[PDB]
Every structure is written in structure tokens, then in C-alpha cells.
């Protein structure tokens, strides 16, 4: 945010400093995995 | 339910295990029967 201030006439302007910052989103990797052994293919009625 | 985890690059995958179970329904037999003697065909105003 900025802000307005007052000054004496003919005096140098004094800015009200506007802050800056950088919001950094760090990218991450996630894995969801499973195994389906072939020995269960003929022993299951479902498709694992 | 499965689950997602993280791992180092080029590392072997380590799955989060998914549980299984079974449910069993037991089948039963029921009967609803009745008799209608032929001698009542001509003696009733309704269709027995």
C-alpha cells in the first residue's frame, strides 16, 4: 500500500515507500501407485 | 483407498497399500402357495 503525506512548500518530496514481496509456490511431485501380481489374474473375478 | 506419496527422482516407487475384504450374502428360499378346487369354479362369483 501507498500513503499520502504532507511536506513544507518547496521541500523535496519524500515518498512513502511501497513494499514489495515475492510469493514463491514450490512445485512438488506426488505419485499414487499399486501392483497387481499376475498370480491373482485367474484367482480374481474382478479386474484388479 | 489408495494414497499418494513422494519419492526422490530416479528412486524406486513405493506404493501405499490398498486393503481388500469380502462380504457374503446367504441365499434362502420361500414359498407362497394355495389350492383352488375345481368344484368351486361354478359356485363362486369371483375367479379364485
Amino acid at each position: 500500500e501507498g500513503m499520502a503525506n504532507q511536506k513544507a512548500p518547496q521541500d523535496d518530496i519524500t515518498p512513502m515507500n511501497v513494499s514489495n514481496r515475492d510469493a514463491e509456490a514450490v512445485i512438488e511431485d506426488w505419485y499414487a501407485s499399486e501392483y497387481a501380481d499376475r498370480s491373482f489374474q485367474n484367482k480374481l473375478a474382478v479386474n484388479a | 483407498e489408495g494414497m499418494a506419496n513422494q519419492k526422490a527422482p530416479q528412486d524406486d516407487i513405493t506404493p501405499m497399500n490398498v486393503s481388500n475384504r469380502d462380504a457374503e450374502a446367504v441365499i434362502e428360499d420361500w414359498y407362497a402357495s394355495e389350492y383352488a378346487d375345481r368344484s368351486f369354479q361354478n359356485k363362486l362369483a369371483v375367479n379364485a
Binding site: - | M3, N5, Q6, K7, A8, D11, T14, M16
Partner: protein, 89 residues
């Protein structure tokens, strides 16, 4: 702190009914921490997904080869909830 890039897996089997073997690089080229620091309670909490429910890649009885910046030692996981704690093998 724990760094996932320094955590590797040794055991090749995908059988989840047995245990796994891990190796951790805490030497000067890794996390650069002592074996005592790595073996402290809750150090491997970041490796778990939900340590409160004991959900993660580490299992009870898993063997971890810890390579600290001063020495190395075999360790074994005892608890995964509510904290991850290891003990000398």
C-alpha cells in the same frame, strides 16, 4: 532437516508383506548432519504422508542405513505414529 533427495531404497522386492531397506545420505554431500541428529525422534516425519495416522512409505521393522557426516550405523524403525523413531540395529 530431512531431505528426500538423499533418501534411497535398497531392497528391490515390491512384496509389501515383508520389510524394506533404505539408505540415507547424511554425509557432507547430503544433509551434512551427525548420526545422532538423524536418529533423533521425529526426524523422518517429513518422509511420511500423514504421520499422525501412520501413513507413509516407512514401515515398522524397516532397516535404514544411516550415513552421517561423522560415522555410519544400521537402524530399525520402531514406530511410525505419532512419530517416526529408530533404534540401533
Amino acid at each position: 532437516a530431512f531431505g528426500i533427495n538423499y533418501m534411497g531404497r535398497v531392497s528391490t522386492s515390491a512384496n509389501n508383506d515383508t520389510q524394506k531397506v533404505w539408505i540415507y545420505n547424511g554425509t557432507a554431500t547430503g544433509s551434512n548432519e551427525t548420526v545422532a541428529t538423524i536418529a533423533a525422534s521425529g526426524y523422518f516425519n517429513a518422509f511420511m504422508v500423514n504421520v499422525a495416522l501412520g501413513k507413509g512409505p516407512l514401515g515398522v521393522g524397516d532397516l535404514i542405513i544411516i550415513n552421517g557426516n561423522d560415522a555410519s550405523a544400521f537402524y530399525t524403525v520402531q514406530t511410525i505414529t505419532p512419530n517416526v523413531t529408530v533404534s540401533v540395529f
